[PDB]
Symmetry: D2
Subunit: 116 residues, 4 copies
Amino acid sequence: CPLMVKVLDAVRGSPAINVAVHVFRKAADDTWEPFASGKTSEPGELHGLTTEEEFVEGIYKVEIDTKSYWKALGISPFHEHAEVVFTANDSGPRRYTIAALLSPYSYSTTAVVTNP
Amino acid sequence: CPLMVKVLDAVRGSPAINVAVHVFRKAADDTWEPFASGKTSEPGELHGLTTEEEFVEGIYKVEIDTKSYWKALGISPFHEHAEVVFTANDSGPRRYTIAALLSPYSYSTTAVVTNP
Amino acid sequence: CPLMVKVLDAVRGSPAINVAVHVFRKAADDTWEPFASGKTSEPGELHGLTTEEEFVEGIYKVEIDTKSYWKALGISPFHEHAEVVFTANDSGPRRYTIAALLSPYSYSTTAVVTNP
Amino acid sequence: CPLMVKVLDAVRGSPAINVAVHVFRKAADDTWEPFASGKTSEPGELHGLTTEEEFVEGIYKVEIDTKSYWKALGISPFHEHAEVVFTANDSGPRRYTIAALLSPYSYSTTAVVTNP
């Protein structure tokens, strides 16, 4: 799986379940084109977004719908989403894990990048 | 000054100096309009972005040019920039500090929202 | 595995390998007694520290030897270690993941706690 | 003032007020001696812990009483306290700010070390 997203809730100390994730790829005309999307599972993970064939070099944006997650738990959070923007595969295929650690008024995001 | 940006470098343990920051506001046509911008100071802060009169309710995006910062230090970074997206909400008086803590392959952002 | 430790390097965007970890349990005389220890593997994880039988209720300290890790990579970091202190199992057996995200001058640590 | 402590609340997006902080210094006998302590102010800061004369090289531990803070807000926390352990090193003039960003099941700490 060349691209995986993992989301944790720092308030509950638990995986963040049912978080919507939207992935875009910058097109030739400099617009963000839809690339893939899904929702995190019970372990807070989203697998199967793409394939090694489809995940070509480019600039990608992973949008994590944090505001919807918190609202559904009764919290009015600060951020609309978390938006992770990066160049991928520009030195050959890599495996990317995009992790996010959520609080109502703060988040961190980390990339773990390995060579298959 | 209702909006301040603070940036810290987690590798050197220092304010992040000369970091470009761009602020956008979503217009009624649903595109991002340039709103304010600048470069952080020696203390890692950017003051004077806006005024109370101009900083009306709306959806804002703060774009911190992290990649250029790391490149200047010779450290290979992951992200193109850090992006902070939020709604400003009048609810009594408020001051917003958007803080960012930078590492090459990870960042955290926190909103500190206070009443003077 | 009732207790797992996971360590990531925020500078390289990689698991932190060969990080020493020492776990203590507060004894009746209020001293920290050695409980378990090990080193992280290639995926940045340390499994097999304890068993459900041995991991009784108590106050535990997980010491992560961050300074030794960074020094071996040519970085003189700020902290001696990271020290994670918590009560465990006080409402029945749980599974605990203690994660740490390392930079030379800053770290975060998160607990993910699940009910078997 | 060569040592300051700053604490932020990532759930409320605010300084963390009335947080107890204890500072210890390792003695020649290798035990932790009380050094300074206090409670954070409205701005989430604790100033006046020590002086240049007293803050000599050595190993220090800053203990932030996070559990009591969360309990006061009615939020179940994971950690007993946050612990920051470091060596102070004369290497030209220096000021140390120990920052902590708190969530119930996660915290980050950063050292910001500057020359006035």
